[PDB]
Amino acid sequence: APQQINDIVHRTITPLIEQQKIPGMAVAVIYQGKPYYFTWGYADIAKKQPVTQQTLFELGSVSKTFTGVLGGDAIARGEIKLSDPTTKYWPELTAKQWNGITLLHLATYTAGGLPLQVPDEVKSSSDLLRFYQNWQPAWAPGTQRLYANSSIGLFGALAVKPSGLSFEQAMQTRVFQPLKLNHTWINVPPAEEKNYAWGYREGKAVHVSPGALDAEAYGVKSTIEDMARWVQSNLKPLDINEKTLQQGIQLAQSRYWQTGDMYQGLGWEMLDWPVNPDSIINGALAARPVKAITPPTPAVRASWVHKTGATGGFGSYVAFIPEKELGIVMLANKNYPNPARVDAAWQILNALQ
Ligand SMILES: *C(=O)[C@](NC(=O)[C@@H](C(=O)O)c1ccc(O)cc1)(OC)[C@@H]1N=C(C(=O)O)C(=C)CO1
């Protein structure tokens, strides 16, 4: 650990943990393509288990990046096309409002107002279909972005249909395995429960609860090591040997839509680098008009590529700059203000060139 990296990391994370009351936290910095790890506090306050490099943390929305990439991998294999209508992979979606809504709109939250979350009452597959048939668009497709688990989560589910595989099998087989993310899961196996940190909310230890389209929108758990590897694969896709997975990573970083200084990829979100920290940090249900990027701009190396995520008891953040071979991962078992995460991440990366 170069003292440089050591000092900026600690100078930054320490006051953060104290101000936010974060019980446990793991940080990885990818510098010149090499990971450096750091860890603080507790994975389980009660059983006094410290956070280590093997601790699993709930990723929350950062899970969408895996989905964007899995989806991009399905495109690469010629199994789906973002230009296909949604109904091509779910012919039972015969309600009229769906004509014109494409897999692209699903993956980028531009379908016309699909809700932030699938309602808790949706139990079964039959319940999911009904929910979608009855959903009433507030806007025409491709006009506004409204961040949503029901939007991407559906994209993920359909993206894997032609393969005959379930979303978990597809994810494990086409993404976790090739990239050697052997400690990343949608369902934490009994053998790895000893490392599953607890989340904390209002002082109580909690874990994410099951829900429809959970795997696809916020269901991944992973370690600081695998997340650092996940960042290295996204920084340098051209080292990935699996052809389709390589294009897939590239496709998830293509710029499909623009909102202010932000560009929407598949899961990942991007801004041109150099970037103002304020342009990312503090400037809900924020509907935002979007401009289509026709055709999409291929992955741009001079970008600040990122994704924020949370569950009831976890706060996570990932951000990297391809052009600089620079990256960072922040995993905490306490959801804390998103602006403090980006503020911390920028302070570290910008300090490393
Ligand atoms: C992504 O992190 C985010 N939230 C979540 O994924 C989960 C959470 O909020 O704890 C989650 C779990 C179960 C659900 O039915 C819904 C969400 O995506 C929704 C985060 N949360 C937001 C919010 O609660 O409004 C956002 C606006 C940004 O993304």
**Distance between CA 159 and CA 167 in Å, rounded?**
9
Rg (CA), the chain: 19
Among all chains, which residue has been given the structure tokens 């979303």?
167
**Distance between CA 185 and CA 207 in Å, rounded?**
14
Distance 225 CA to ligand 1 centre (A): 24
What is the torsional sign of CA 261, 239, 248, 212? negative
* 3-state SS string for the chain: CCHHHHHHHHHHHHHHHHHHCCCEEEEEEEECCEEEEEEEEEEECCCCEECCCCCEEECHHHHHHHHHHHHHHHHHCCCCCCCCEHHHHCCCCCCHHHCCCEHHHHHHCCCCCCCCCCCCCCCCHHHHHHHHHHCCCCCCCCCEECCCHHHHHHHHHHHCHHHCCCHHHHHHHHHHCCCCCCCEECCCCHHHHHHECCEEECCEEECCCCCCCHHHHCCCEECHHHHHHHHHHHHCHHHCCCHHHHHHHHHHCCEEEEECCEEECCCCEEEECCCCHHHHCCCCCCCEECEEEEEEECCCCCEEEEEEEECCCCEEEEEEEHHHCEEEEEEECECCCHHHHHHHHHHHHHCCC
Q: Is 276 annotated as a binding-site member? A: no
Q: Is 287 annotated as a binding-site member? A: no
Q: After which residues is the chain broken (C to N over 2.5 A)?
A: 283
The number of angstroms, rounded, from the C-alpha of 49 to the middle of its chain's C-alpha atoms is: 27
Sequence-ordered list of residues with C-beta below 8 angstroms from that of 41, at least 6 positions apart, any chain: 17, 22, 23, 24, 25, 50, 51
State the closest ligand 1 atom to the C-alpha of 64, by its place in the atom list counted from 1: 1
Distance 332 CA to ligand 1 centre (A): 16
Q: Provide the residue type at 63 as one letter.
A: S
Tokens of 97: 């409002």
Residue among 215, 264, 271 nearest 70 (CA): 215
Distance 77 CA to ligand 1 centre (A): 30
Give the mutation target among 109, 117, 120 for probing the ligand 1 site: most ligand atoms within 8 A of CB.
Answer: 117
**Distance between CA 258 and CA 264 in Å, rounded?**
6
Query: Domains plus CATH for the chain?
Result: 1-353 (3.40.710.10)
Distance 35 CA to ligand 1 centre (A): 28
Instruction: Specify whether the CB–CB gap between 332 and 25 falls below 8 A.
Output: yes
Sheet holding 303-310, edge to edge: 49-50, 34-44, 24-31, 326-332, 315-321, 303-310, 269-272, 262-264, 255-259, 291-297
Distance 242 CA to ligand 1 centre (A): 32
**Distance between CA 108 and CA 141 in Å, rounded?**
11
State the closest ligand 1 atom to the C-alpha of 214, by its place in the atom list counted from 1: 13
Give the mutation target among 58, 61, 206, 334 for probing the ligand 1 site: most ligand atoms within 8 A of CB.
Answer: 61
Q: Is 95 annotated as a binding-site member? A: no
Residue 353: other Cβ atoms inside 10 A: 10
The structure was resolved to a resolution in Å of: 2.2
Between helices 63-76 and 149-159, what is the axis angle to 10°? 40
Please give the span between the terminal C-alpha atoms of the chain, in angstroms, as a whole number. 16
Instruction: Specify whether the CB–CB gap between 179 and 230 falls below 8 A.
Output: yes
Residue whose CA is closest, atom 17 of ligand 1?
117
Among all chains, which residue has been given the structure tokens 């874990």?
207
**Distance between CA 204 and CA 313 in Å, rounded?**
9
State the closest ligand 1 atom to the C-alpha of 149, by its place in the atom list counted from 1: 19
Residue whose CA is closest, atom 8 of ligand 1?
311
Distance 78 CA to ligand 1 centre (A): 31
**Distance between CA 296 and CA 104 in Å, rounded?**
11
Instruction: Specify whether the CB–CB gap between 29 and 352 falls below 8 A.
Output: yes
**Distance between CA 282 and CA 294 in Å, rounded?**
28
State the closest ligand 1 atom to the C-alpha of 310, by its place in the atom list counted from 1: 2
Residue whose CA is closest, atom 23 of ligand 1?
284
Catalytic center residues: 61
**Distance between CA 12 and CA 276 in Å, rounded?**
18
**Distance between CA 228 and CA 115 in Å, rounded?**
31
Residue 7 zone, left/alpha/beta (φ > 0; ψ -120 to 50; rest): alpha
Instruction: Specify whether the CB–CB gap between 87 and 103 falls below 8 A.
Output: no
Residue among 87, 78, 128 nearest 105 (CA): 87
Return the biggest CA–CA distance within the chain. 61
Bridge partners of 255? 297
Question: Who lines ligand 1 at CB under 6 A?
Answer: 60-61, 116-117, 147, 149, 211, 218, 309-312
Residue 308: other Cβ atoms inside 10 A: 20
Strand 303-310 and strand 49-50: pairing?
A: unpaired
**Distance between CA 328 and CA 231 in Å, rounded?**
8
Q: How was this structure determined?
A: X-ray
Q: Is 182 annotated as a binding-site member? A: no
Instruction: Specify whether the CB–CB gap between 323 and 6 falls below 8 A.
Output: no
**Distance between CA 245 and CA 153 in Å, rounded?**
20
Instruction: Specify whether the CB–CB gap between 268 and 234 falls below 8 A.
Output: yes
Name the burial class of residue 192, with classes exposed (0-12), middle (13-18) and buried (19+) by CB atoms within 10 angstroms of its CB: middle
